[PDB]
Amino acid sequence: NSNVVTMIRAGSYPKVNPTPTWVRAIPFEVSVQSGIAF
Amino acid sequence: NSNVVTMIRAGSYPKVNPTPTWVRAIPFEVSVQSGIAFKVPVGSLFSANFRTDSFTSVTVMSVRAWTQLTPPVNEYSFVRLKPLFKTGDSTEEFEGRASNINTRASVGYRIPTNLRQNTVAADNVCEVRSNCRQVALVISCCFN
Amino acid sequence: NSNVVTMIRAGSYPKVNPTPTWVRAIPFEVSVQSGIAFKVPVGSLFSANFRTDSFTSVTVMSVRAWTQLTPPVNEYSFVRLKPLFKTGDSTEEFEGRASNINTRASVGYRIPTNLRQNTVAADNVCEVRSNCRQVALVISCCFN
Amino acid sequence: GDNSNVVTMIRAGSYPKVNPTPTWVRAIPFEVSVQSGIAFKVPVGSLFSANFRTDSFTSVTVMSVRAWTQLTPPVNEYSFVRLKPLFKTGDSTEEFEGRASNINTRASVGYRIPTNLRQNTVAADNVCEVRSNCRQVALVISCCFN
Amino acid sequence: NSNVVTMIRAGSYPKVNPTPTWVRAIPFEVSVQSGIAFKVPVGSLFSANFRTDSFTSVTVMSVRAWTQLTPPVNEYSFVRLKPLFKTGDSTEEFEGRASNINTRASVGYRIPTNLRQNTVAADNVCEVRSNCRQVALVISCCFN
Amino acid sequence: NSNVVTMIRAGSYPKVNPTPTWVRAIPFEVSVQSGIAFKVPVGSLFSANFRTDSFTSVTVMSVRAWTQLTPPVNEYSFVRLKPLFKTGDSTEEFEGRASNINTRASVGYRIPTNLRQNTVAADNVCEVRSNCRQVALVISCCFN
Amino acid sequence: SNVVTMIRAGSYPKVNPTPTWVRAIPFEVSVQSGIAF
Amino acid sequence: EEFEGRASNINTRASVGYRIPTNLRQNTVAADNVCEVRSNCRQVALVISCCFN
Amino acid sequence: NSNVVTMIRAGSYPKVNPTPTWVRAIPFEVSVQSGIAF
Amino acid sequence: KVPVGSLFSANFRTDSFTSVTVMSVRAWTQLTPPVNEYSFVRLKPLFKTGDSTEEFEGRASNINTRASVGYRIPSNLRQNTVAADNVCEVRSNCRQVALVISCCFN
RNA sequence: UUUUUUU
RNA sequence: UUUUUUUU
RNA sequence: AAAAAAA
RNA sequence: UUUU
RNA sequence: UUUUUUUUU
RNA sequence: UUUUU
RNA sequence: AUUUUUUU
RNA sequence: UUUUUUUUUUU
RNA sequence: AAAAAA
RNA sequence: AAAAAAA
RNA sequence: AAAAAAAAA
RNA sequence: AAAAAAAA
RNA sequence: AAAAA
RNA sequence: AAAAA
RNA sequence: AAAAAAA
Ligand SMILES: [Cl-]
Ligand SMILES: [Mg+2]
């Protein structure tokens, strides 16, 4: 690996997206009663 | 696969994380003045327009810059980048020029692993010099 | 082959369909206002100019857009696309910019197989944002 | 690819070539009314209709013609159908005929047009002549709309 | 090789033809008006400027088009080609647009073998539509 | 093979040439007298009868000759050829005779590469001698 | 090659007038007895 | 020598360069001249691969 | 090998130099005196 | 008509030659074309044994870009030419044309 | 999987 | 190994 | 991780 | 064979 | 294997 | 393919 | 395998 | 999934 | 890749 | 590779 | 198509 | 391919 | 080893 | 170890 | 290449 910064020979402006998607596993809790579906 | 729902034989409750990390490329523009350097604030990355307003720190991995507007008359666009760090600011001027007056001038730099610490909104990324008055940025970083 | 007509030993009457499907790439332009998002109607795909005035529903596969007019002074062209769905509109701004002021800015997005359902004229494909006053779209879709 | 569940960005390039009104290779099914002992000239205009999504075309290149007897034959007779191809450069004299071996079964026949004789035709033109003892003949024509 | 003239032991008189065929690619320009479709005459191919004033018929194989002049302000160049045949005209509009306002817009089409019959001067090859006032055409044909 | 028109994704405007070269085999006849040599003019190659009235120069490669009429009584047909060049005429009399009185006489010669330059209408290619009153000539040449 | 040659240069390349440079710096320091410097 | 390069597009830069052979790679002090530059543009950018000592 | 002029699909303007270099060996004579170096 | 005497010059170190054997000629438009047009340039090869009628043309697909074309003289037509001769004819909508001629001075 | 220039 | 060459 | 390519 |  | 960042034909 | 020994 | 004879 | 005759380029 | 099972 | 198309 | 996320059930 | 200097 | 897209 | 170069 | 046919 390195120890200092390196120059990147960039080119044309790429395709950008400030708001992409996101695959997640969302953990949250719900309140359930006896014998009734929530 | 199939066309209907299937049963999952799930086991013990897994190790979960409701607020995980996220590596991104954040496009945002800055305004530059003639013959004057502009420090890029890290707080520009944290925004609801980037889905990152929930983060407070970020580890920047690389910076890339483009000239966002046209250069002064008779000139070709140029853009420089001077890296900045809380442990010590750099003096490198990674400069990129355009061979066509109508074409953007681009340049970028990479941060080594040893210099990839976290940065808060009060910190600064780098300095941007250009004969153009606006410079587009695409920073590859890790939000944590 | 031959220079004359040849008999065909046909058998039973086959399975027919006078109105089959059609996989097309439809080119059409829209008008975009500054800083205002334009919703592209699906009805722009059903037209006699495309031979598709006989269809009422279509399954869109990929949408790509090009700036049709020049950008404002001192500016480089850009174009954004926010995919829209009847089961849930999206928030992605697939943006593409031009590195030359005299050159178009282009970008596109692909629709996954799990979201490839039919749409009628009342529906909208996506939003379009740009600094140019017109945008050319080439929508790859399946007419049915 | 085929495993994605959301939208993905396409790094499109320059604006491509386009054609809003391309060609279309089709098989067009339709029927014609025929009388006894007389030959009916099948018009090409029967292909340009909104029922076939082809009312936007004005020319077509026919490749092959297939015919079936659509109605029952006269009593005590078996179904038959004939075809005589027609061309603007010169009509033909062939009689491609097929007879049904069962009174309850259709009679089918067809002919393929050679590549040298595959030019365009307009609605005013005719494809072929149909002869049959039945009153109605169903046709299936393979062609290229342009 | 050889440095001097050598004798050719010729035989019987062969089969000759003083006016042979000639497969050519003919370039020429046509003026086109905005919004109006211009029919390209076959008679433009027969000229002394192309060494073809001795022909009276030709078999066209493929036609390509380029925009000869600059487009209107703010507009990008385009050009359309609708093929034409004596047995029946087509409704195709093979269109090509330029991704740079300073560059030409190009498009073309190929005639299938079954449609490669002779064409005299009175006929027309295709219609051309463009926003530029002149169009350059290159026609690969077989003069006979 | 394809049975309809096919789009051609054309690119930049290419290199063109409305007046190209033409490799040909030009046949004609010349009247010859007895014992006298006939200088064949190059100008006979430039005519509308050969589609060549648009050329002014030509590079001759090889010449062949045949006797066009019947020989005198009791004689066999013969024909001679003497190459001529502007830098210097040759003294070779390439001769071919007929072994049948009813049959033509034939003879030719090939011009070397070093001696293949252009010739205008005012130049001569070779001399012809024969006992018949007419001689048929076929000249392989490169019009330019 | 004993003479100047022509370089077919293309577009303007990325430049940096102030690079990083890796070094091994030699210098001396004064030390006192028992004291850390 | 006058190693020349021309731009095929009016909006594009013109470029050219020359390499010095090892036999002519001596040192040059501040009072010396590297080369002469001619151009129809009022300013030229120079990139000189050199060995400082 | 060809007998006619042929077109050359040229592109961008090349790098040129109207005054190039030249590798030569020059034959020339000098006058020498006895017991003297010239 | 491009003269051959333009090849013999002290600016090219060739003022000591009197003849030259031209091999191939290439041309580029040196100035911008008229308004609304693209650059073009033509070349008609000339020979003392007979001029040719070819018009090798090259057009630009960009108004800002040069046009370019060239031709090669076949070996059989590669003789010497003196200053009073001419190489070829040039036609263009631009007011200057840059020529790069590959030849053999002798 | 080309290699050549000081820590 | 100096200047011109040959199918992206 | 610094000079001139990386095919 | 028609498409982007 | 998929979603976003970087590499390489 | 087309035109040429 | 450049030219002129002889050459299946 | 296998042939007799009217012309017919090329191995 | 549905629903059952050495 | 998907759709339309001939045995 | 770097991480985060169902598993070859 | 290119005159010049070389070269088992 | 020649041509014309 | 046919002719001329 | 074009005319019986064959499962
Ligand atoms: Cl061709
Ligand atoms: Mg161009």
Which nucleotide is nearest, taking the CA of residue D112 and each C1'? Answer: T6
Residue B121 to residue B42: CA distance in whole angstroms: 5
**End-to-end Cα, chain I, rounded Å:** 54
Tell if C25 CB is < 7 Å from nucleic strand N. Answer: yes
- Whether chain G has a CB inside 8 Å of the CB on B109: the answer is no
Cβ contacts of E103 on chain J, cutoff 8 Å: 61-62
Residue B96 to residue B66: CA distance in whole angstroms: 9
Pair B27, B47: CB distance under 8 Å: no
Interface with J, mutate which of F52, F57, F113, F141 (most J CBs under 10 A): F57
Interface with A, mutate which of C76, C90, C94 (most A CBs under 10 A): C94
Residue H41 to residue C87: CA distance in whole angstroms: 60
Of all ligands present, the nearest one to the C-alpha of J38 is 2
Contact H5 I15 (CB under 8 A): yes
SS3 state of residue E8: strand
Residue B96 to residue B65: CA distance in whole angstroms: 9
F88 CA → Q7 C1’, Å? 33
Residue of F nearest to D14 (CA): F11
Which letter, b or e, does each residue of B31-46 get, where b requires 16 or more Cβ atoms within 10 Å of its Cβ? Answer: ebeeeeebebebebbb
Tokens 């600064």 -> residue: B124
Single-letter residue type at E60: V
Give me the residues near strand L, CB below 7 A: G 1-3, 5-6; I 8, 14, 16-17, 20-23; J 23-24, 102
Token reading at F41: 């003019």
Give me the residues near strand V, CB below 7 A: I 22-27; J 104
Going from the Cα of E61 to the center of ligand 1, the distance in angstroms, rounded, reads 9
Q: Do chains I and A touch (3 or more CB pairs under 8 A)?
A: no
CA angle, corner C54, sides to C52 and C57, nearest 5?
A: 80
Cα D125 off chain centre by: 14
CA nearest to D114, candidates D61, D67, D66, D68: D61
Token reading at H35: 């080369």
Contact G5 H21 (CB under 8 A): yes
Residue H1 to residue C38: CA distance in whole angstroms: 60
Pair G12, H15: CB distance under 8 Å: yes
Residue B16 to residue E9: CA distance in whole angstroms: 96
How many other CB atoms sit within 10 Å of the CB of residue J22?
23
**End-to-end Cα, chain C, rounded Å:** 36
Residue E43 to residue I22: CA distance in whole angstroms: 56
Pair F34, F129: CB distance under 8 Å: no
Sign, CA dihedral B42-B44-B50-B52, equals: positive
Q: Do chains C and D touch (3 or more CB pairs under 8 A)?
A: yes
SS3 state of residue E81: strand
Q: Tell me how far CA of residue J23 lies from CA of D144, E46, J87, in angstroms.
A: 52, 33, 11
Token reading at E40: 């390209």
Of all ligands present, the nearest one to the C-alpha of J61 is 2
C-alpha torsion B116→B119→B124→B128, nearest 10: 40
Residue D87 to residue A24: CA distance in whole angstroms: 67
| Distance of residue F1 Cα from the nearest chain I Cα, in angstroms | 32
Going from the Cα of B61 to the center of ligand 2, the distance in angstroms, rounded, reads 37
Which letter, b or e, does each residue of C118-127 get, where b requires 16 or more Cβ atoms within 10 Å of its Cβ? Answer: bbeeebbbbb
Q: What is the resolution of this structure in A?
A: 3.2
Rg (CA), chain D: 20
Sign, CA dihedral D115-E24-E90-D22, equals: positive
Which nucleotide is nearest, taking the CA of residue C11 and each C1'? Answer: T7
Tokens 């630009």 -> residue: J60
Q: H34: buried, middle or exposed (CB in 10 Å: 19+, 13-18, 0-12)?
A: exposed
For B2-104, where are the E strands, in sequence order? 22-31, 38-41, 57-67, 78-83, 94-97
The secondary structure of chain A as a DSSP string is --SS-EEE---S---B-SS--------------TT---
Cβ contacts of A14 on chain D, cutoff 8 Å: 11
Contact A7 G14 (CB under 8 A): yes
Contact F144 I5 (CB under 8 A): yes
Strands B57-67 and B134-143: antiparallel
Residue with CA nearest C1' of nucleotide O5:
B24
Going by C-beta distance under 8 Å and a sequence separation of 6 or more, which residues neighbour residue B79?
B65, B66, B67, B95, B96, B105, B106, B107, B128, B129, B130, B132, B135
The secondary structure of chain D as a DSSP string is --S--S-EEE---S--EE-SS--EEEEEEEEEE--TT--EEEEGGGGSSGGGT-TT-S-EEEEEEEEEE-S---TT---EEEEEE--TT------EEEE-SSTTS--EEEEE--GGG---B-TTSEEEEEEESSSEEEEEEEEEE-
J89 phi/psi in degrees, rounded to 5: -105, 140
Q: Tell me how far CA of residue D134 lies from CA of C55, D10, D83, in angstroms.
A: 35, 58, 14
| Distance of residue F105 Cα from the nearest chain E Cα, in angstroms | 8
The secondary structure of C46-106 as a DSSP string is SSGGGT-TT---EEEEEEEEEE-BPPPTTB--EEEEEE--TT------EEEE-SBTTB--E
Cα E81 off chain centre by: 12
Residue D79 to residue B9: CA distance in whole angstroms: 65
- Whether chain H has a CB inside 8 Å of the CB on J14: the answer is no
Contact D63 F9 (CB under 8 A): no
Which residues of chain F from 18 to 37 reach within 8 Å of chain E, CB to CB? 18-20, 22, 24-28
Residue C31 to residue C66: CA distance in whole angstroms: 12
C-alpha torsion E46→E47→E49→E52, nearest 10: 50
- Strand order from edge to edge, sheet including D60-69: C6-8, D108-112, D60-69, D136-145, D24-33
Domains and CATH numbers, chain F: 1-144 (2.60.120.220)
